[PDB]
Symmetry: C2
Subunit: 362 residues, 2 copies
C-alpha cells in the first residue's frame, strides 16, 4: 500500500512519512520472524519424518533378505539380492545425505537469519526508539519553557541540541540496518531455496546413475525370469500328465508289502501291524514295526524311541490264532512275555510270519 | 532343475506309507509355514514403509508451502518470484514422483507378495487338506478292515474293497500334494525375484523423472547462482557507500540544528512542510506538535502520514501573520483568517523567522 521511504533525506527531515516508514518495516520484520520460525518448525517436521521413513525402508529391505534367506542357496536369487538390495540401500543412504543437506541450509540460511542475522536490526530499533522518546521530551520541554525569566531555556536549547544530534544518528543507524536486512532477507531466502534444489540434484543424479549402470542386468533378469516362468509352467504340465497316467494305470490300492532284507547285523523288515495293548483295555492299535538285530520293535512316528516288544527273537515261537475274533492274527511268544499282532491281509499275514520264522534262525 | 522342498520326498516311502514319508511331509509343512510367516512380516514392514512415506511426503509438502509463505513477505521482487516459482514447482514435482514411487511399491507388494501368501498358496492348502483327509480315510479303512469278524466273508469282501479304494485315493492325493509342493517351490523364487525387480524399476522411473526435470533447470541454477553472488557484492558496495555517507553526515554537518522546514515538489507550485507546535484554539491549553504544510494556497497540518489534512488557512490571500515577542512561550506567531485563528510555535529563533517570512512570502506570492 505505502512505499517505505528511508533515505537520509527523509531521515533528517523527521517527517510523519519517515515515521510511517519505520512502523511498516517493523511490521514486515515481525512477520519475517514469525514466518522463519514456523518454517524452522516445518523443517523439524520434515527431517524427523524423513529419518523415520528411511529407517522403515531400511527395515523393509532387511525383511526382503530375511525372506529370500529361506530354502537352499540359489545363485541367481543371490546375485539378484546382491545387486538390487545394495542398490535400494544406496538410494536410502543418498536420501539421508539429502536430509542432512536440507538440515544444513535450514541452519545456515534460515536459522542464523532469525538469530544473529537480525541482531543489528533489533539493536538499532532499540536505540532509535530510545532516542525518539528522549527527543520528544526535549522538544516539549524547550517549547513549554516561558521566556519571562529564563536561563533554563538556554539549557533547554542545548539539551534539545544533544537530543536532536543523538536522534539523528540513531535514525540513520536504524535506516542503515533496515537497508541491510532488506538485502539479507532476499539473498538468504534465494540461496536457501537454491541449496535445497542443488541437494535434490546431487541426490537424483547419484540415484539415476547407479540405476542406469544396472540397466543391462535388469533387462537380462526380466528376460530370464519370464523364460523360467514359462519353463516351469511347461514342467508342471508334464508332471500333471504323468500323475494322471500314474493314477489311471500304475498305482492301484494294494497294501504295501514289506520286503525281507538281509541287513548288516541280520534280517531286517519294517512295516505296519496292528498290535494289542498289554493293559486291561486290550486296545488294538496300528504301529510301525521293525524286525532288526533279533528284536521286534515298534514306533508311532519317525524318530520315536522304540518300544521293544521282543527282547531276543531266538527265544520265541510264532503261531496263528484260530481262536481269536479278528482275522489275520498271530502271536509271538517269548519265555515270560507274549505279544499279539495282526496283519491287514492274508498275504500280509504269511509274509510277516515267515519273516519272524526266519529271524528265529541262528 | 534341483530338489530342495522336493529333495526329501521319496516315492517309495510314500507307497510304503512309512513314518519317514509322514515326517518328510511335516517338514515341508514347517517350511511353507515359515515362508508364510516371513511373507507376512514383509507385508507389515511394507505398511510401515508406506505409512511412514506418506507422512514424510505430507510434512515435505507443508515445508514447501511454508517456503512460499516466507517469501511472499516484504516488498515484492521479480527475481525472487521467478526463483520461488521455478523451485517450489520443482520441489513439489519430486514429491509427486515420490508419491508415484510409493504407489508402485505398494502395487508390487500386493501383486507379488500378498497374492503369494493368500491365493498363491491356495493350491498347496487344498492339496494339504485333501491329503490329510486321504490319510484319515485310509486309517479308518484299516481299522474297519482289521475289525471285521472271522467268518463274515461278505463283510470281509466289502471292508477289503473300501480299503483298496481308500489306499489308491491316499496315493493319488500324495501325488497331488507333491505336485503343489513343487509349484510352490517355483513361485517362491520367481515371485520374490519379480517383486525385487519391480521395486528397482519403480526406483529407476522415480530417479529418472527427478533427474531429468532438475537438468532442464540446470542453466537457470548456474545463472541464479551467478546473479546471487553478484547481488551480494553490490550490496556490500552500497552498504559501504551508506556508512561513508553517514560518517560524513555526523562529521561534516550539524552542530545539532533542528531540521529547517523543507521546500519541495510541484503540486500547485512549491510546497513547504515542517513540524510546529500548535495551541488548540479555544482556551484549550494544549501545545500539540503537528506537521504543517503550505500547499495550494493553504496552510494545513497533519499528525500522521495517513491523516486527512485539516485546513488552518483556506486561502493565503485572506490571512495575516504577526510575530509575538511578547507572549508566554518562546518563538510564537499567529495566523488569522476570516474563519480561523491559530497560535503556532516554532522550536528556535531561526525557525520562527523561517516560517513567518515563509508565510508572508506565500501571502505575497499568491496574489500573482
Amino acid at each position: 500500500s505505502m512505499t517505505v521511504k528511508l533515505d537520509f533525506e527523509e531521515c533528517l527531515k523527521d517527517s510523519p512519512r519517515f515515521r510511517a516508514s519505520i512502523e511498516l518495516v517493523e511490521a514486515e520484520v515481525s512477520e519475517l520472524e514469525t514466518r522463519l520460525e514456523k518454517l524452522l518448525k516445518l523443517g523439524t517436521g520434515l527431517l524427523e519424518s524423513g529419518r523415520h521413513y528411511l529407517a522403515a525402508s531400511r527395515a523393509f529391505v532387511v525383511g526382503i533378505c530375511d525372506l529370500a534367506r529361506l530354502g537352499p542357496p540359489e545363485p541367481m536369487m543371490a546375485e539378484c539380492l546382491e545387486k538390487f538390495t545394495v542398490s535400494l540401500n544406496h538410494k536410502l543412504d543418498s536420501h539421508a545425505e539429502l536430509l542432512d543437506a536440507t538440515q544444513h541450509t535450514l541452519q545456515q540460511q534460515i536459522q542464523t537469519l532469525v538469530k544473529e542475522g537480525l541482531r543489528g536490526f533489533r539493536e538499532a530499533r532499540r536505540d532509535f526508539w530510545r532516542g525518539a522518546e528522549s527527543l520528544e521530551a526535549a522538544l516539549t520541554h524547550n517549547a513549554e519553557v516561558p521566556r519571562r525569566r529564563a536561563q533554563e531555556a538556554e539549557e533547554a536549547g542545548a539539551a534539545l541540541r544533544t537530543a536532536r544530534a543523538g536522534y539523528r544518528g540513531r535514525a540513520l543507524d536504524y535506516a542503515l540496518q533496515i537497508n541491510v536486512i532488506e538485502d539479507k532477507r532476499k539473498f538468504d531466502i534465494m540461496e536457501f531455496v537454491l541449496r535445497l534444489v542443488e541437494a535434490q540434484a546431487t541426490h537424483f543424479q547419484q540415484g539415476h546413475e547407479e540405476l542406469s549402470r544396472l540397466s543391462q542386468y535388469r533387462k537380462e533378469l526380466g528376460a530370464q525370469l519370464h523364460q523360467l516362468v514359462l519353463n516351469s509352467a511347461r514342467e508342471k504340465r508334464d508332471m500333471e500328465q504323468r500323475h494322471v497316467l500314474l493314477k489311471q494305470k500304475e498305482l492301484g490300492g494294494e497294501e504295501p508289502e514289506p520286503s525281507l532284507r538281509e541287513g548288516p547285523g541280520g534280517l531286517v523288515m519294517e512295516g505296519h501291524l496292528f498290535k494289542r495293548a498289554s493293559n486291561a483295555f486290550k486296545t488294538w492299535s496300528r504301529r510301525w514295526f521293525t524286525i532288526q538285530s533279533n528284536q521286534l520293535v515298534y514306533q508311532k512316528k519317525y524318530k520315536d524311541p522304540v518300544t521293544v516288544v521282543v527282547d531276543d527273537l531266538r527265544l520265541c515261537t510264532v503261531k496263528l490264532c484260530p481262536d481269536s475274533e479278528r482275522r489275520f492274527c498271530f502271536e509271538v511268544v517269548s519265555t515270560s512275555k507274549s505279544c499279539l499282532l495282526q496283519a491287514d491281509s492274508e498275504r500280509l499275514l504269511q509274509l510277516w510270519v515267515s519273516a519272524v520264522q526266519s529271524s528265529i534262525a541262528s
